[PDB]
Every structure is written in C-alpha cells, then in structure tokens.
Design a binder for this molecule. Structure first.
Ligand code: GTP
Ligand code: GTP
Ligand code: GDP
Ligand code: GDP
Lengths: 429, 430, 430, 429
C-alpha cells in the first residue's frame, strides 16, 4: 500500500535502470530468475510463484533493450513492458518528440494505466533519462506532458544525465538539452543533476579504480536511488515519504533543480584503515569535490539539504555533528531559510552488489541538496547554445520534422528567466 | 473511575505512544499478551483508568492510533507490546500527509476525521466518568500536527466539560530535522492555543543534552529519548492512579497552574536520572532529588529558566517519604530562589505526594513548571517563520491545497500576541 | 557537623589529594571500596565531617577534582583508593593550561569555573553546618594556580562567613623545576592575600632535606613527600574529628593565630619522624617530641626561623598524655627561647590536645607556626620575579591571552607591601 | 583526548619519519602488520581490527615514498595519506614553494582537515623537514603558512636538519636554507636544530660504531622524539604538556631556536662496565661534545633547559644533582632568567628498537636547551650566503620560477635582525 512506478526511457536511462534493478533484486534477494527463495514498492507478486517489476522500458533503438531481452534478466521483466521502436531518435528533439513519439505515447500510456490500476497506494513516479540523446529527451518530455495532464496531483521525479561541462560525447546535445528543460521545467517536481564528469573524477579519487567504465557509474547511481527509497522499502527510525520532498526542497515551484551526493564510497584496502565516524562521513558529504554533479557549491549559497542516513546511527550525536558542519564557515544558507537541514534515518545498512568495486560499510549518508551554485550550469550551457543558434547550425535537422523553427528562441528566453530567479533568490533581504 | 483515552498521531507520536504503553504495562504488571503478572492489588483496583477488561479476562488499552501512512501500523504491531492494542482502533490512510500541514488538516486528514471521531465517540460513550483526554504528537509532522489539531478542535467542540492535554514535542530549534518546520509549528500553535488546557513542550535538544551529559550515555537512540518522555508521562498522573497521602488528579493541576485561560504551556522535568557508573554512590533522598530537579538542564525544554521566572511550579512526588521534609525543602528552595518565582503570586509552588514509586526506584519526582521562559522558544520559532515567510519560501505547497495566506498572517499575529502576553505578565509587579 | 569540602587543582594538588584521602580512609578505617572496617565507634560518629553516606551503605568523600588535562583523571582512578570519589565530581578539560597562568585563569579555566561552581554549590547546599573549605594546589602550575585562585575568589565572594584554607606548595626556590615559575607564583600570591584565611606554604627543598637527613631514606619518591604532607594535613584537624581533653577546630586556629587580616601565611611541622634503623631506640614521649618539633629543619619551609621570630605558634597534640607535662614543657620552651618569640604578644604559644593518636603511633604533634621568617621566602621569590620581569622574559606568553602588564606591576607592589608588613611588625617592640 | 599530528615533508623528514614510526609502533607493540595483539596520541583505531597512524607523508619524488609503499610497513599507513608528486623540487626554493606546491597544498590541507576533525584534544603539530632540499624547504614553508592562517592558536614544532658547518652534501643549500628560515621564523613556535655533523661525531665516540650510516642517525632522532612525547603517551610523576613548551622555552617570541641533547647513548660492552648514576647521566647531558647540534654551548649563555627524565628517577636526588651542575662554573645563564631549569619525569624506561645499536638502559635524560651559542650558526651560515649572492651565483635558477629576485636580500636582512636580538639578549642589565 505504498509503491512507485519507475519509467526508464532512453539509452542512459535504461542502462542505469538495468543496474538499479540489479541492485533492487539483490537487496531483497529476489533471484534474477524471478522467484524469491516488503517488495510491494517495486516488485508485484503474480498471485503465485514469481514477481514482476514495476517498470516500463521505453526505447526505440532495439539494441540495448534487446540485449536486456537476452541478458541475465531475460525471465524477470514482463514480456510486454519492454517497448522497442523501429528506428532511432538521432539526437534531434523534433524526431523523438513530434514524429516517432506520436506513435509510442499511446502504448506507453496504456501500459502505465494497466500498472497503476494494479496498486493501492501509489506515491510518485521515477523517470530516468539522458538529455543529450534524442529519445531520452523527446520521449521523456512527451511522457511527462501526458502523465501530468492525465494524473494531476501525483509527484514526478527525474534523474537527468546532463551534459558535462568540459568532457563531451555529442555535439548537438546542447540543443536537445535546452528544449528538454523547457518541458521538464514544468511537469516534474524534482530534477536531480547527475553528471558524468564528477562521477568519473570520484571513481578516480575515492574508489581508486583507474579506468572507470559505465558499469561502475551506473552502479553508484543505483546506490543513490536505493538509499533514497530505503525509507519506503525498509524499516527506519525517521521515515520520510517520497511526497514530503515536494514540500521540503522545492521553495519556489519553478526552482527545483537539486544536486546529490553520496558517502562513503571507499575500496577495501583503505576501508579497513579508516573508522568512518558519523562526523567524518557527514563531513565528506558536504565536501565540494565529491558532489555528484560538476559544481563547486562554495560558489553560491545552499537552500535546502535532505540528508538520509542508513545503518547504525546515533541520533543526538548526528545532531551534534550537523551543528558542527553548520559552524563550518564556507557553507552558508540564504537569508530566508533558517531551518537548514532536514534529516532522515533508516536501519537497513548499505547493501553491496556482489562483484562491485564498492565495499560493504555500515553507515551511509545520501544528501540531496538544493543550492544556488547549480545555476551556473544552465548559464554555461546557454553559452554553447548561443554559439550555435546565432549561425543556425544544425537547425534544419530540427525544422525537418515539422517542429516550428522559432521555438528555440522561446525556450531559450524561458531558460534565461531561470537566472531571473537564481542569481535573484540568492540576494539577501 | 476517571477514564482517560490516549490518542496518537504521526510517526513520532506513535513511537512515543508505544513506549508509554509498554512502560505503563510494565508498571501495572501486564505482560505483552494482556494478563496480570504482578503481586499487589493496587495495580488492579485502578486498572480501569487506562485499560478495559477485554472479553475473556484479557486487558486492552483504551488508546487510538492514527496516521496517513500505513508503515507505523506494522511498525507498532511488530514492535514489543503490540498485541495489546485492539484491531479496531487502528484507523489509517494510504496517501500520507507527507510533511505538509494543509494536507493533513484540509485535504486528506479531513477525509478520516469523521471515522476517527466515530471511534472516539464509541470509546467515550462507553466510559462512565471521563476525566479527559491526552494526546501525543509532533508539531512538525504533517500527519502529526494536522490530524492532531483537527481532532482537538473536534473533540473540544464535543466535550467542553473535560480537559485536553497534549504531550507535544515541538521542533528543537537548533538540532532541526526538516526545513519546512516553522510553518507547521506556527499553524499548530495557533490551534492549540484555542482548544487545549495543558500543552507541555518537549524539544530534542534538551533530551540529547540530558542523555548526553547526565546519564552519560554513548549513542542516544530515539527509543531512549522516547523512553524518557514515557517515564515523565507516567509520573504525571501516577499520583492519581494509586493512593497517596496527598492525592492529586488532572484537574487539580489544571486549576493550580494556569492563571490565565491561555497561559497553558508547561515544561516537564524528571528526577532522578543518573549514569550507571555513578549509580552506586549517590543517595535516593529528597535533598538530592530537589537539587537535581530544579536544575536548568534537567528539563525537557531548551529554555534556561534563569532567562525568566516561574509563574507556577507543581511537583508530584512518588514513593514514601516524610512529607514534612518535602515541604520544608520546598519552603527553603522558594525562599532561596526568591527571584525566580514571580512575586505577585504567593507560595506559587505546589506539591503532591503519592505512595507507590515506579518499577525500580524508591523515590521519583515529576516537576511541571508553567514558566515565563518558553516565551523565548516561541519568539525564536517566530523568527524562523518570519524569515521563511516574507520571501514566501515553500509557500506554494501550502497555497495549493486550499489554505490561504490569511491563515498564516493571523496565526503569526496570534503567536506574537501569546508571547506578548507572557512578557506582559512577567513584567507587571505588585 | 562542621563539614569540610576538599578541592584539588593541578597535578601536584591532585597527587597530594589522593594521598591525603587514602591516609584519611586508612585512619577512619575505610577500605578502598567504601565500607567500614575498623573496630571502635569514634571513627563513625564523626564520619560526616569528611565523607557522605552513599546510597546503599557506602561512603564517598566530599571532595572535588579539577584539571585542564584529563591525564590526572585516569591517574587517580587507576591509583589506589580511587573507587571512592564519585563519578560526578570529576570535572575536567582537554586543552590543558600548560603551565601558563593567564590560560588557567582568563582563557580556559574561565570556561569551566561555572561548572565547578555549580558542583561546589550542589555540595555546599546539601550540608547543614559548613565549617569551611580547604584547598590543595601547586602555585607554579598553570592549572593549579589559575583554577585555584579563580575558584577561591568565586567561593569567597560566595561564602564570606566560612573560612578558606589552602595547603599550597610554593616553588622551592633552589631546587626549581620550571623556569616560568616566579610569574605564576606572584600572580597567585596576589590573589591568596585577598580571599584566604590560612595559607601554609610547603617547599620541596625542606621536604627533600627531611626525607634525606631525618628519615634517612635513600630514594625520595614524590609519593613519599606527598605522604608526609598528607600526614600533616590529617593532623591539622584530627583534633576536631575526635574527642579531646582540650578540643579545637578550624576557627579557633583562625583566631588564635593571625593578628592582622593578611598576616596569614603559616609554616607546618610534623613530629615525630625517625628512620627505621633508629626506630627501636628513642622514646615516644613529649620531651623528645618537643625537642624534635621546634627544630629549624623539622619544618616544611626553607626558612631557618633563627633568621626571624614567631608571631604565634600553635601545637596540636594527639594521643593521650598528662596535659600538665605538655604545658610545663611549653612554658619552659618559651622561657628558654624567649628571643624567638616576639615580646609584644604575651604567651604567644597555644596548645590543643586530642585523644586518639594516628594509625601506628602513640603520640603525634602538628606544629603550625605563623612566623615572620617566611617573609624572606617571599623576598627571594620577588628577586626572581624582578630579574625575570625588567627584561620582559617570557612576557608575551602572558600578554597574548589578554592579561596586561598592569596586573604584574600592581601584584609585585602588593607582594612588596606584604613583606614590608611582615618586617614592620617584626621591628615594632613594646 | 590528547593527540598530535605528525607531518613528514621532504626526503630527510620522511626518512626520520620512517624510523620514528618504527619506534612508535614498537614501544606500543603495534605490529607492523597494523594489528595490536594509550595510542590515541598517534595511532587511531578504525572501529575494529587495525590502527592507522596520524601522519601525512608529503613528498614529490616518488622514490622514497614508493619504497615505503613497498617496505615492511606497506599495510600500516592509510593508502591515501602518502602523497606523491610528479617531479622534483631540485633544491631551489622557488620551485617547491611557487610552482609545484601551489598544486599539492590543497590536497595536503584537505587531508589535514580530515584528520583533525577525527580527534577531540589536538594539542600541537609536529612537522619534520630538511632545509637544504627543495621540497623540505618550499613545501614546508608553504604548509606552515597555510596551517597558521587556518588554525591559529595551536602550537607548531619543527625538526629542521640544518646544514652542518663543515661537512656538506649540497651546494645551493645555503640559499634555500635562509628563505626557509624567513618563513619558519614566524609560523612555528619551536625549531630544534638537529645537525648531521654532531650526530656522526657522537656515533663515532659513544656507540663506537665506526662507519655510521643514515639509519643509525634517524634511530637516534626517533629516540629523542619519543623521549619528548613520553609525557603525553605514558604515565609519569611530573607530566609536561606539549603546550607548556611555548610558555617555558620561548622568551621573546622571535628567538625560538633550541638545540637538543640525549643521554645515555652507550653500546653494551662499555654499558655493563658503567653504573650511569643520575648525577653522571645529567652531567653527560650538559657536556658540549654530545650536543645534538654542532655548537660549543660554552661560547655563550644558556636561557632555558627543559630536562625530561624517563625511567627510575629519585626526584629530590635529581634536584641535588641539578644543583651541583648549577655549581659547574662553565655553564652560566643570562641575568634575566634565575629560574634556570624546568624538569619532567616519566616512568616508562627507554624502549629499545630490536637490532639497533643502542643498548637498553634504565634511565634517560633528554634535554632541550635554548641558549645563545646557537646564534653563531646563523652568522656562519650567512657568511656562505654572502659569498654567493654578491656574485648572483645560481640566482637565475630561482628567478626562473617567477619568485621575485630581491626577496633574498629582504630575507637576509630579516635574518640579520636575528643577531640584533641574540648577541643583544645575552647582554647583562
Ligand atoms: N551516467 C550514465 N550515462 C550514460 C549511460 N549510457 C549513456 N549515457 C549517456 O547518454 C548520453 C547520450 O544520449 P543518449 O540518451 O544515450 O542517446 P539515445 O538514447 O540513443 O537517443 P537516440 O539514440 O537518438 O535514440 C551520453 O551523455 C551518455 O554518457 C550510462 O550507462 N550511465
Ligand atoms: N638526519 C638525517 N638527514 C637526512 C636524511 N636523509 C637526507 N637527509 C638530509 O637532507 C638534506 C638534503 O635535502 P633533502 O630534503 O634530502 O632534498 P629533497 O627532499 O630531495 O628535495 P628535492 O629533492 O628537490 O625534492 C641533506 O642534508 C641530507 O643529509 C636522514 O635520513 N637523516
Ligand atoms: N523525541 C523523538 N522525536 C521523533 C522521533 N521520531 C520522529 N521524531 C520527530 O518527528 C518529526 C517529524 O514528524 P513526523 O511524525 O515524522 O511526520 P508526520 O507523518 O506528518 O506526522 C520530526 O521532528 C522527527 O524528528 C523519536 O523517535 N523520538
Ligand atoms: N611535593 C610534590 N610536588 C609535586 C608533585 N608533582 C608535581 N609537583 C609540582 O607541581 C609543580 C607543577 O605544577 P603542575 O600541577 O604540574 O602544573 P598544572 O597542570 O598547570 O597545575 C611543579 O612544581 C611540580 O614539581 C609531587 O608529587 N609531590
């Protein structure tokens, strides 16, 4: 009677989804065959025998979803919730949002309805999508619009793999990023900036894995998502609902872009040579280096901090350590928020995925922070946008699909108004 | 006689309630399955004040639980001492208020208040002499504050003759969990000033300080602070539950304390609390009990009384002692701390001595002080609220569910009037 | 009746305090676990002067410990006779004063004096008749001198009616440990002249000479000199603790001694002390006790009285003796050493005979002499200070923590006024 | 609740560090594997199992620190606190203080903060560095400046391996010595002159080891440091805090250069044929020959003497012997200090490192003396400096790294002012 719905759309979305479902099936021990030797948040029981996950896997390139249909989990998912298109989106938002998506939105909504009617306490959706890609942008925006007009009150959370500042892997990805924001600016309540530069830096410094590959990346992301959902799934002293998030961390309903962080991420050989006191772990939490997104939170002021611990936690001493971190004179909040940190505790210690590089440690802080530093990303990103749209580079590969031309500028202006907020709300009163 | 219904709301209130119920059961000598396992007869002649004779010779507590999410249900059931609560009283929702007051007071809780009122009417119609209600709920949690204050308005427009007490655990100002707390805090303090008679604030800061310096614990677990508040809750009325050389009740408190129909916010204090390593040395007598009771950091409210005074201070002793020694120590402590007690009320301290100490102690002291110090607490929460409001921080989450800003404006006005009242009484002298 | 709180500061004061407490326990017949193991009843009728009845039939000493570093804590705990002290009284810091007076009197000790005063108030509010305090602390150590003098100012502005005694161990001038000593010494002697009634100086030079020539020891260990001072400390008031043919107290000392509100610096002396090889020969009678008591090098202050005189000299005898013999020997020794006793005060010697000797002796003699000889000691420490100051040696360590040189200037002025007072009284004759 | 932080920077610093940690792990018996079969001063417990030392090992030449990463203690230290650069400092202060150190100071400060937050009673840092080298000078000065601006009140102690008067092992080492002083003159409270000539002379006369090698040298230095820290670590009659040092031995806050001495350092075959009375051991303490630095303390006047004994000690008789040494008419103090000697006792007898040439003897005096003789070293050293800077020898290898040229002269003048103090403070009044 308390469940979610996890939509994985796009390439990076579905890869992180594969990894995350690995994790979920492992910590509940739900064997990859689909039979178990609390799970109503994700897996639903089919009356007898096996379980089926609550997740639709929308994608149009049958490559990765086909590999999943033949991977280790070929018998887990339902043979229908894995939708495969016919062609690709090709990075141009117009394609995956006007021509192709116009055909698959119907099937996706039918599936979503058939899942939501089989639940009794749905709380919030959890979409996953990249932005640089075509499908992860176009199809993501389309679904968000349709679900928002169809469901209404429910809260939607996203996990956007934004473009890194310097390291890049596409070229038109600024374009179909901006548009993806001009939709995601409305139909979603929390957008967590999961970047790819900061995570590779992290795996190069903390876990000492010298040559990090996408598998380790997605593993870490799955870890964060499970540490978020532990409140609903497992027991805990201080439960937090996925719905009190829209209340705590979204001050002005337009500014809802939050960056995450995780600790402790250590390999064994230095893990033994370390105690990881709650003070130490939460002091590594606020450290600017290991912020999951590429930013220096020093550059601005924080606005909210949802810190969830899992494992053995001595509460009043956590309170003491949080106070000490409030004394740390480099992290300062805006004037209008004195109630600084919101916390949560859960008893379930971190569950380690076998073979993964991460070591099994008793306590773990996952911190979702809404700050003002994140703003600069948008700013910097618009820069790229500017240097293209001024010369109409690649625009015709968008106007080909019937998408109106000028919309870009419109969207751009909208995103410019974001700064009308950010560098504004950080002003004292 | 003088039955009392227990009401719980929100997950904090529910944990505290489970702890209080297991402590009461282990005092009255009631095993977790619901039978008697003591030795005396006092523990059974007054069984009806809390429990009910359950069909078959069992005993079930007269408590009701509520929460907009069903996790707390299975939590308290699987937890120790869960088999007692009857399967009817568990009224619960699915959506969850989710830490948004308007949700748990206008939108969803407004859907369940009808049923909760029906069950409370079925449990209050079956009693003969109803001495009043007592509540336990956090004033930060959406479910807690919303459900609680709505239920309070309902029952206090229902039963005006009886009293309404709330073991409310206000947000600890410094050590603060959530950042949307001041809104819930103020929207609940505007309601509790209307339809309540005794509101004893408890803050996690004072509890951590106590479990961190007096008991010399190492890892203060929420279960432990809950247990401390449970001990205080028992001691409050245990002078009623058992015979005593100078008996008491809830209404003698309600009259000997609040000099003005709204100045009804109390501080609690338990004694004696001491570490295990130092347990074997000091003595269990009323001198040390007094020196340990009146301490500033012995209480459950982060308000050093030396920043104010006491309008009135009751002390419910438990155990067996020569009353003359108790009264002499009271006289001496008042004439020693003459400043801390306001002058325009004479002999403002009250005592009440019972006859049976708790399980495992010889003496025990509950100290209930209606002071003019917590006005400072309300003041600083008002500061938080103002700095969060005049920028309309997080305001739309409340505006959406139908509540209008006029409620917030008038509620902050009412809070300021409350604190101005406190100060205006601490000022006037004669 | 007439309770006495023991206060210790600094590591030297703490070692001396542990030694004194184990000696007192082994006199009153109290095993290290805190029960009675004597035979008489005297040792228990007057138990309340020092100890408290601890809950459960135990006994705990009414002593408080303090130090800015936590090494002394575990030192005294692991040491013999540590289980007695209650776990509350151990108030300690982490930073450590580190042999810098301004640290332990303005910077850090100023952070703990509040708590130490709270615990002293909790131990002085629970007594009925408080005969006064006694302190033990080194006047060289930052923690010792700083914490001590600050606590002294606090309590003497608190309890003016009671007395304040300090078993202070001044720096031995020649055999000197630290080189920043004169600054601490003078900054403490300026405070003790304000708010103290009996300050008995003890120097390690005299103690080494005694343990090196009288007892004929071989390797004088700090434990041993501490034990000697412990014996003297016991004998001081053991005439009060037990019945006696001519009883005494602390205030009869305070009146029969100090003729001027500041001339309150005493020399101590114990008798009889003799080696083990010579133990079997000499006799334990008051003749030899007198010949051994008045010796110049029998005392605990490197001041040969033959370089001065005595304003007054009390002698507290212990054991059982024909008082007439004691008094005749007193008369004979005064009329034999007529010069050494100043003339303008007649019969300046005082006696006080108790009834119970210590553990292992038949007679015992404490000799407390307020002389005009230690002015020489203060003079030479002033010499050290001046030669260290007018070059501002090590001055910045004090200047940094906020203290200004005006304090040092006026304090040296006050010290010079003290010694001028002593000499001006030794001079005037009538 | 009483601990320190030991920074080992540079080559000689880290070699003495290797030896000193050998000693510390041995006397507490902490096995080199890192598991023990009082240590909170140095090793911290990691909640269960093993211990980790409180020491960062900054260096830029991976040779020696790499050998440590493969030495006998490869499993002891934390796999992170051993920072290795990319290139060398090459003896020119400008390099290790302007170009390279600008990159490693950040990582070192992050490590230092992560260690200091995991302690409750920190008292003083203990840096170790040579001066002739580049890194031991540049990086040492840089860290001292950063910690002084970051921490404030805490007391810092150094152990500088100054250039010997006659025997030399570098050529530009006067230059990057002077500059290292012009920084170390401020941000550090006690600088102990540990020279290399006097120690080799000592091993040639006392221990009779004919061909002394750097291992024995570092062993002796480790012995002195442990004899200093015995007050905090082990029990003792007369404890001394590492903070009362800034009070006793630093009269005028600028003149804080003290020279050490140790006794008794004997080999077995003459050890048996000797009683080593406390009078004898403390009489060998003040002997000018075995002064750890190359000076003849007769040449001037002493100013302070912190003498710490360890082992069986008869206090009042120590007082007697100290008095006798005060009668020794060749050691005289300046006028303004009559309170001559400060003492301390500890019960823990000297702990012998197995295999080492030093014999296990019951008592041991370590004496840190602040005198006026040490001054001449600076004087003599400036001489060398003069004979180079007058011809601008090697200066361009400094101006290459952007370091301003004239700073030398400035620093020189500053150090000249040192004599404005020394030969001055030794004047009677
Ligand atoms: N964090 C993370 N990012 C990924 C992963 N796989 C792909 N990405 C990112 O996806 C982004 C490219 O956009 P995609 O969504 O993959 O493109 P697409 O889904 O194929 O869209 P179409 O190909 O047109 O159908 C790049 O930034 C990738 O780094 C992954 O496993 N983990
Ligand atoms: N007492 C002692 N001195 C040493 C030791 N090892 C090296 N030294 C001295 O270090 C000085 C040379 O400066 P270094 O610090 O070694 O040079 P560096 O650290 O390599 O600086 P860069 O090479 O430029 O990175 C010489 O005087 C050495 O005698 C040792 O183990 N013990
Ligand atoms: N003293 C104490 N306070 C608690 C405990 N659990 C939760 N609280 C507080 O309860 C507050 C949140 O209210 P909550 O009941 O979780 O939200 P609700 O579901 O809307 O009622 C927070 O301030 C928690 O810190 C507990 O076990 N002991
Ligand atoms: N007679 C005696 N004197 C001691 C003993 N221990 C320390 N002292 C003196 O105590 C003086 C130092 O004061 P100390 O307490 O160590 O410094 P503090 O921590 O600031 O109080 C020195 O003169 C020590 O010689 C002892 O055991 N016996």
């Amino acid at each position: 009677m308390r469940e979610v719905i996890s939509i994985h759309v796009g390439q990076g979305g579905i890869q992180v989804g594969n990894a995350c479902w690995e994790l979920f099936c492992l910590e509940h021990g739900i064997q990859p065959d689909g039979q178990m030797p609390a799970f109503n948040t994700f897996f639903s029981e089919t009356g007898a025998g096996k379980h089926v996950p609550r997740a639709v896997f929308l994608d149009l390139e049958p490559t990765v979803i086909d590999e999943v249909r033949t991977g280790t989990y070929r018998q887990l998912f339902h043979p229908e919730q894995l939708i495969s298109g016919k062609e690709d989106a090709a990075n141009n938002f117009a394609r995956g949002h006007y021509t192709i998506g116009k055909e698959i939105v119907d099937l996706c909504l039918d599936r979503i309805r058939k899942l939501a009617d089989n639940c009794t306490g749905l709380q919030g959706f959890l979409v996953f999508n990249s932005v640089g890609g075509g499908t992860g942008s176009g199809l993501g925006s389309l679904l968000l619009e349709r679900l928002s007009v169809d469901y209404g009150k429910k809260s939607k959370l996203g996990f956007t793999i934004y473009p890194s500042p310097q390291v890049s892997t596409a070229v038109v990805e600024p374009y179909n990023s901006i548009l993806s924001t001009h939709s995601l600016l409305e139909h979603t309540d929390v957008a967590v900036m999961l970047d790819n530069e900061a995570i590779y830096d992290i795996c190069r410094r903390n876990l000492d894995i010298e040559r990090p590959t996408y598998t380790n990346l997605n593993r870490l992301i799955a870890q964060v998502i499970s540490s978020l959902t532990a409140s609903l799934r497992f027991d805990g002293a201080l439960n937090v609902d996925i719905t009190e998030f829209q209340t705590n961390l979204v001050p002005y309903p337009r500014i809802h872009f939050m960056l995450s962080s995780y600790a402790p991420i250590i390999s064994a050989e230095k893990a033994y040579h370390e105690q990881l006191s709650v003070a130490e772990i939460t002091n590594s939490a606020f450290e600017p280096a290991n912020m999951m997104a590429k930013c220096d939170p020093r550059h601005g002021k924080y606005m909210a901090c949802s810190m969830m611990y899992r494992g053995d936690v001595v509460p009043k001493d956590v309170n003491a350590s949080i106070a000490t971190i409030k004394t740390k004179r480099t992290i300062q909040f805006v004037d209008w928020c004195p109630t600084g940190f919101k916390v949560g505790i859960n008893y379930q210690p971190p569950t380690v995925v076998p073979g993964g590089d991460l070591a099994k440690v008793m306590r773990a802080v996952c911190m979702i922070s809404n700050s003002t530093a994140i703003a600069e990303v948008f700013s910097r990103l618009d820069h790229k946008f500017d240097l293209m749209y001024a010369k109409r580079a690649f625009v015709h590969w968008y106007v080909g699909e019937g998408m109106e031309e000028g919309e870009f500028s419109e969207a751009r202006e909208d995103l410019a108004a974001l700064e009308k907020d950010y560098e504004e709300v950080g002003i004292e009163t | 006689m003088r039955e009392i219904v227990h009401i719980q709301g929100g997950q904090c209130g529910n944990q505290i309630g489970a702890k209080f119920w297991e402590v009461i059961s282990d005092e009255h000598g009631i095993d977790p399955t619901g039978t008697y396992h003591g030795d005396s007869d006092l523990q059974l002649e007054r069984i009806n004040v809390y429990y009910n004779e359950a069909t078959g010779g069992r005993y079930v507590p007269r408590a009701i639980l509520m929460d907009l999410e069903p996790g707390t249900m299975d939590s308290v059931r699987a937890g120790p001492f869960g088999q007692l609560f009857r399967p009817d009283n568990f009224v619960f929702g699915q959506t969850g208020a989710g830490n948004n007051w308007a949700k748990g007071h206008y939108t969803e809780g407004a859907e369940l208040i009808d049923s909760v009122l029906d069950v409370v009417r079925k449990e209050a119609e079956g009693c003969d002499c109803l001495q009043g209600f007592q509540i336990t709920h956090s004033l930060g949690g959406g479910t807690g504050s919303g459900m609680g204050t709505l239920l309070i308005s309902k029952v206090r427009e229902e039963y005006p003759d009886r009293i309404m007490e709330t073991f409310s655990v206000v947000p600890s100002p410094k050590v603060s969990d959530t950042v949307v707390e001041p809104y819930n805090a103020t929207l609940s303090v505007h309601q509790l000033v209307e339809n309540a008679d005794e509101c004893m604030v408890i803050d996690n800061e004072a509890l951590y300080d106590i479990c961190f310096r007096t008991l010399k614990l190492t890892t203060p677990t929420y279960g432990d602070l809950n247990h401390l508040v449970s001990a205080a809750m028992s001691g409050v009325t245990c002078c009623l539950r058992f015979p005593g050389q100078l008996n008491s009740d809830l209404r003698k408190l309600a009259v000997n304390l609040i000099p003005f129909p709204r100045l009804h916010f109390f501080m609690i204090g338990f004694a004696p609390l001491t570490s295990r390593g130092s347990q074997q040395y000091r003595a269990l007598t009323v001198p040390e009990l007094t020196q340990q009771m009146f301490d500033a950091k012995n209480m459950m409210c982060a308000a050093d009384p030396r920043h104010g005074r006491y309008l009135t201070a009751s002390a419910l002793f438990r155990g067996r002692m020569s009353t003359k020694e108790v009264d002499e120590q009271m006289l001496n402590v008042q004439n020693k701390n003459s400043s801390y007690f306001v002058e325009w009320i004479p002999n403002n301290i009250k005592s009440s001595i019972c006859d049976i100490p708790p399980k495992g102690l010889k003496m025990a002291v509950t100290f209930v002080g209606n002071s003019t110090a917590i006005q400072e607490m309300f003041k600083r929460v008002a500061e938080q609220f103002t700095a969060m409001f005049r920028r309309k921080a997080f305001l739309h989450w409340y505006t959406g569910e139908g509540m209008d800003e006029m409620e917030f404006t008038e509620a902050e006005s009412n809070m300021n009037d409350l604190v101005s009242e406190y100060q205006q009484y601490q000022d006037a002298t004669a």
